[PDB]
Design a protein around this ligand. Sequence first.
Ligand code: ADP
Ligand code: MG
Length: 77
Amino acid sequence: PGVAKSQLLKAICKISPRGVYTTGKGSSGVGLTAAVMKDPVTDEMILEGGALVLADNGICCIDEFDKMDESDRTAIH
DNA sequence: GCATGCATGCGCATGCATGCATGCATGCTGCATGCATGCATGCGCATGCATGC
Ligand SMILES: Nc1ncnc2c1ncn2[C@@H]1O[C@H](COP(=O)(O)OP(=O)(O)O)[C@@H](O)[C@H]1O
Ligand SMILES: [Mg+2]
């Protein structure tokens, strides 16, 4: 504890053009991969992207890696 | 001075601008029906955690 790892993650997420900062249990399930929603404007079925889909061609920053679910860890794998 | 015809009012008859109610029918309109739609609900099942042993 207290060696400034999280500050480094915050900094590296501020320097990258595309980069997302997420914490262990606050981003679980469809908040990582994708979700099914209906588009209000075009009346079509879309897929909403999660953190991993927002950081495509970028850097993803995950904090408290040891606390995540097994399902979330499979996706990272 | 007498005889005459015209213009002046009476004394009929008819038409005519105003005005208002009634029965029938027009013309709209408020009501009842049917339906599409999208959000919420009440539910049973699968996963991840906490509490023993
Ligand atoms: N080497 C360091 N240099 C500067 N600040 C540090 C250093 N180590 C820790 N800190 C400070 O101490 C705190 C550590 O918080 P954090 O980044 O969450 O540490 P950790 O990731 O280990 O939990 C922050 O305020 C950070 O600025
Ligand atoms: Mg930390």
